[PDB]
Amino acid sequence: KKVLTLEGDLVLGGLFPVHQKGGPAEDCGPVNEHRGIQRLEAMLFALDRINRDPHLLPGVRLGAHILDSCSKDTHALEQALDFVRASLSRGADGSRHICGDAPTAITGVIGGSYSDVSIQVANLLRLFQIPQISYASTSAKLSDKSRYDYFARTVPPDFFQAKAMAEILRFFNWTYVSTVASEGDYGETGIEAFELEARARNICVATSEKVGRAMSRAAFEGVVRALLQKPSARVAVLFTRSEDARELLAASQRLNASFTWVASDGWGALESVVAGSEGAAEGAITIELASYPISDFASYFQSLDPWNNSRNPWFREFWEQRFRCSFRQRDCAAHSLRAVPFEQESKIMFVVNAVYAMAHALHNMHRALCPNTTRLCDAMRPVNGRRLYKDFVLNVKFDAPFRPADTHNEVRFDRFGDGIGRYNIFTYLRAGSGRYRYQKVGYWAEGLTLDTSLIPWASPSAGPLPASRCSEPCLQNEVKSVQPGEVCCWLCIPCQPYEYRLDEFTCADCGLGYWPNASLTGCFELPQEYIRWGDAWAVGPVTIACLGALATLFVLGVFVRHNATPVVKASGRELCYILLGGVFLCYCMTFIFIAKPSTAVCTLRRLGLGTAFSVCYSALLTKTYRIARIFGSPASQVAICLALISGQLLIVVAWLVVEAPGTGKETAPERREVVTLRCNHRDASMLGSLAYNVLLIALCTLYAFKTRKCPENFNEAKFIGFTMYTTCIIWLAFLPIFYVTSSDYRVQTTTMCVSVSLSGSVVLGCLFAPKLYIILF
Amino acid sequence: HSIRIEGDVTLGGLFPVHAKGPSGVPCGDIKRENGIHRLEAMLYALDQINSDPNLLPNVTLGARILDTCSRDTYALEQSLTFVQALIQKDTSDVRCFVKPEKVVGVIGASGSSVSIMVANILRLFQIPQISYASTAPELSDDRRYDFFSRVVPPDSFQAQAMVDIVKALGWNYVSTLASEGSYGEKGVESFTQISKEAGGLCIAQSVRIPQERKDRTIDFDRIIKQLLDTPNSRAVVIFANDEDIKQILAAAKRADQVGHFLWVGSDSWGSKINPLHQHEDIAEGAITIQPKRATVEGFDAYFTSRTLENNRRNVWFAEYWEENFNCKLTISGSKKEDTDRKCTGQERIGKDSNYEQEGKVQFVIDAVYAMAHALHHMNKDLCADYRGVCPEMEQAGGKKLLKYIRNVNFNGSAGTPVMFNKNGDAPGRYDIFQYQTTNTSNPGYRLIGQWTDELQLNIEDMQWGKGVREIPASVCTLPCKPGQRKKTQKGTPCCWTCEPCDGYQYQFDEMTCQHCPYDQRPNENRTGCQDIPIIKLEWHSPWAVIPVFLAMLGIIATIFVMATFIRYNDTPIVRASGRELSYVLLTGIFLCYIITFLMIAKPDVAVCSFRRVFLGLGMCISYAALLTKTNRIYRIFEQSPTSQLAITSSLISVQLLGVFIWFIVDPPNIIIDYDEHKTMNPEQARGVLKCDITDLQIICSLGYSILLMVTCTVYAFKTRGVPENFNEAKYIGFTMYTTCIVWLAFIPIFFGTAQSAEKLYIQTTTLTISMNLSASVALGMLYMPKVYIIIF
């Protein structure tokens, strides 16, 4: 019913909601002091400054055709229809009067404080070839250009704050943050943008819920319990509005448990509504749009009077309401606007930025179309409404006017028709001595720049900042898990303790004993040493070998000195010397068996252990054979033993030339020395032939022992037979000991050395005893 | 000039009686026949609706017809003219006052692009739009157009019909072909969107048709070439207009391709003769779709009895006669200088003009009827107790009207029913057209079947019908399913290379080939590792005949030695020798023969439970008699049969406890087959099996006999020195030496024989033959003296 119009060469338009939705009966209720009149006077003052700016639009003066929507849908449609009715070709339908004003083309439709009115106006204006920029439209619904082509909001929508949230969360190194939103459409699209940005930044999300506004405190208690009942982090996200955030903080205070969280534009400052719960909100950072006060607009609005400014009837009704009176009584002149303080909101900056952006776009297109003329050229008389928006409105580079010199805004429009946003981060500072109040730490113009010293918990003096890591980093140890599902944050799980880090997810083993100092490279069996057996354990074998060598030398010296004895004269003196030499060679083989193990070492030890045994066995066999043949030539007896051992020599030589040993170490346990123990030759047919030859020699000795009627040296023959039986028993015992210790590492070698040393010592002392009785005793 | 018809409730109308040829003026002077045959049909629908007592008897139905010639602004102005009268404020304009009427809905939105721009503003207000000729399917969504209801099926329904007709016609892959800048682009987009989700449908190729230049025909020659590049692809769907369809068919005709790929047309093709002329090869198999083209006899009856005196309701019919065969009107306009003949005197020239009612003509009558039925439902549910129209219509909204229009299931002008889905789209009632020249000579489009919700067509409608509906059904290659395949798909969609898997693995459900457990191998079909009975070593002719005969020949010797053993006790020759020695030798020979014959039987769990000790007992029993003989001749040679029997029993007891010990090591079981050969057609290969008998066990069992043979040879070396008793000691020594030589050769056969997979049928046979030969030699040497005594 009321329309504000201003005469101008290129008149613009405006849709500012001055009233609110009253109900089904009444059209709209009383005017609002904050969102309906102050923004209207703001855009009026901005347009007046535009008309009085010599550098901006000098030739053409733009007007205004502003309408009120009463914060409704059908009313918004009916009022926005006038902007197009003024632009219709026919204008007025032909009709016959039962018994004036001419339509003026409108270029700009700057307006829209709510979401539904802006959606409807953009839907109506997208197809009528007319641009429309908004100042307060934070819903993500007007983002798809397919549904809203001509729309360039100067305010950043709430879903752009997801980038600032991700920047904040990555600045403090937080991963397992939780979040909470509302069941409304704006809440769900904002939280969806938040999840999208978090996935782009690879940030985990603990829980995601939508809390309502028409629920009691029981539902809020339940949802906060479901949020804090899964403890893996201390940081949360609060994306809901202030009306719900107040009750959420009250419920959190009822839990007597507080933590840190980030807040969206709903809880930017909002200090008066949530002042009840001061303990729960002790540590928290919020997000608030940058709104610098305008000294020019404030001075203009403070000096407004209906008598001097009567071109705005809505302003007259606002003056009547704010200073309740009646024009019939003429008591409104006594009331003064300077008596009550003036409170500026955050949308005056947006309306002035929008009108200045449109003025700059008009100036740019006028300079690019007809720069020779300063007034509207004939080509610019009809406004296209589409190129002006696509090429000039969207691609604008004007600086924000009416701002302090120390601050720089530089608001612009992106390809999606959205204004560049500057967000100031407000944190709740704890002030026990004084009163709790907020504090600005940084801004989000282009990149996140905030100081951690101003933040209490972020400052190192108060303590370490709270973390949101679901797990703690582990050192060069058990590998990280590769379980799916929970791939947002990682956890390293224990492996077998005998494995290294092959990769970031593979847990293999490449060598024990030495810890690799490198990260992943470096794999070797073991830096083995030359000697592995301990000195204390090897002392026994060395002492036994020394005692055996000393006993053989004493027996050889006694036989050499007592060479004229009748017992040694009628016996094998050369055979006795050969047996003494073979017994002395047994101590050398036992000592060599405990030397540095290697290929040549193992072959030499095996060859010596075989040769000494074969030599003594052949000697005793020849002795018993002669004793059984004579009692029932020395060259032949000396050559037959060589011919006998030649078979074993050829056998071992053939086995040596048939199988070449190496240095291949195979370890059954997961943690053991890779040092060579005895040799590379495992259990094969080599030990079978030697065991068969030893068994045949023992059987031949036992068969030759069958004689028992020896009249000469009967005691010596009995001692030799007892020694042969003892050696056979020792070999039989060593065979089961070697069979049981077939898997032992060094115990088998120690037992074999002890057995061969004991057999050699017994064979030496058996013959040394008769010599001792003959000479020493 | 709009059309005003009096009525309590009126409906909107957007009909293109003009053209958008000249861009300077909003609408061209020329008119279109398709756009002029629809608004008269709506007028007939309205004047027939407000004429009967069964449809809106108490309220008359008005009309508000406006022209929209498919312009971005003029059509927008005419559509905005509806909501301007709804508000009708008009408080600023003063001349020196009229009665406005609200509109309940619109039966306009003829053009595809006009529907979007009309519904975008009609969504904001409470006025629906019931389109009739819209083709673009992107407006079928409810989130962007919730006040829209199409009476014709969109292109998405056409794509669904194409999917259903391709799935039910054999082939699964089809090369799509559409033209951009028209409904073809949206049609192919919907086709891909609905085929990606569809299971069993494949896309062979996707090519665009450029509409910038078609007179050169240089692109169409290249398109048909690259379409033939892909193998066995004979199905192609066309969503473009007829203009380039004629050119592509002409190109396919002049090219004379060897592939002869069948064509699939769209609603643009339908059943027209224009594109093809004397083209039989390219027309064969051109299965094309077309919606139900009904004819309303009432509209034809009303459109013949028209005059310039009674048809004064519409303003465009006066100038409509200018589109006839060069005739004009002089009552209002000025005659042209080219022709002065007048056609107002008679209307027979219109009948002679051979006009035909378009298919979209009956699509504006059912829309008006549906809105009238929605208004009737409104009246019945709100103000069914009023004399005329109730005031509850002006204060109502459009939401209830949309809800009442959605649940509309009445029978329209023709015999087919009309209904709307949840998105405001009517179900697709298409007719399948195929060109055939073999059954009839005249050009025809004989109908196959109807497509309303399912496929009710004639599979055998074609004359051949043998395999022509299955020739393009392929897997990108020849069909390969003989029972041994492996479906490996990489890169190429809905296709896999016809390649078999390894011979050691059998397929499972034609998906993958896996390995079966040991002793099993895939059959000739590579479908499953079947089970077959193992082979047997009984009655083998090629090689076992000689050892079988050698073993059977010992029965006579065993029977002769048994009867001679306890017999002839009077002669001193048998009295000098040990009586138990001959019996022990006979028992050993019998045990050796039984052990040799036991190898013929197939071993089992219970067989080798007692056969594992029969072989070892036979060898040790034979050496006992020789040892006893040497002991006796050594005791007699200096300067006891009872003790010999005890020594033999102790030697056998040493072997009995031994075999018990080496048997208690593992339970008696059967071993699996040992082979590393490939798989052939006889899946039942040579599966030789036995109990726990290996080379080490055989060596340990035969080790005891080696020492006995060595001792016997050592004793015979000295026994042969002194010849006595008819050189019996010399014969015993010769027999012992022969036995030792035979045993030495047996060790070389079982040593180093690792280059033969038939060892179980060769080495055991050779060992048994050697043992039988040694036993026969011993028996012949022992029984020689008895034979000589019996002869002499």
How is this structure best described in words?
- The complex is a heterodimer of chains A (777) and B (792).
- Helix content of chain A is 41%, strand content 7%.
- Chain A has 777 residues and is an alpha/beta fold.
- Chain A has a domain at 158-292 and 423-450: Response regulator (Rossmann fold), CATH 3.40.50.2300.
- A four-stranded mixed beta sheet of chain A has the order 1-3-2-4, sandwiched between helices.
- In chain A, helix 10 packs across helix 11 and helix 14 (573-592) packs antiparallel against helix 15 (599-630).
- Chain A is rod-shaped.
- Chain B is an alpha/beta fold.
- Helix content of chain B is 39%, strand content 8%.
- Chain B has helices at residues 33-36, 39-49, 74-87, 112-124, 155-167, 183-197, 218-229, 242-255, 297-302, 348-352, 362-382, 398-406, 545-552, 554-565, 572-576, 579-598, 608-611, 614-636, 641-663, 695-719, 728-750, 763-782, 784-791, and strands at residues 3-5, 9-15, 61-67, 103-106, 173-179, 202-209, 235-238, 262-265, 287-291, 430-434, 447-451, 506-508, 512-514.
- Chain B has a seven-stranded mixed beta sheet, with helices on both faces.
- In chain B, helix 6 links the parallel strand 5 and strand 6.
- The A-B interface holds A 77-78, 81, 84-85, 88-90, 92-93, 95-101, 120, 123-124, 126-129, 147 and B 26, 73-74, 76-77, 80-81, 83-85, 87, 90, 92-98, 117, 120-121, 123-125, 144.
- Chain A: One of its GO terms (molecular function) is calcium channel regulator activity.
- Chain A: Residues 561-574, 706-718 are cytoplasmic.
- Chain A: This is Metabotropic glutamate receptor 2.
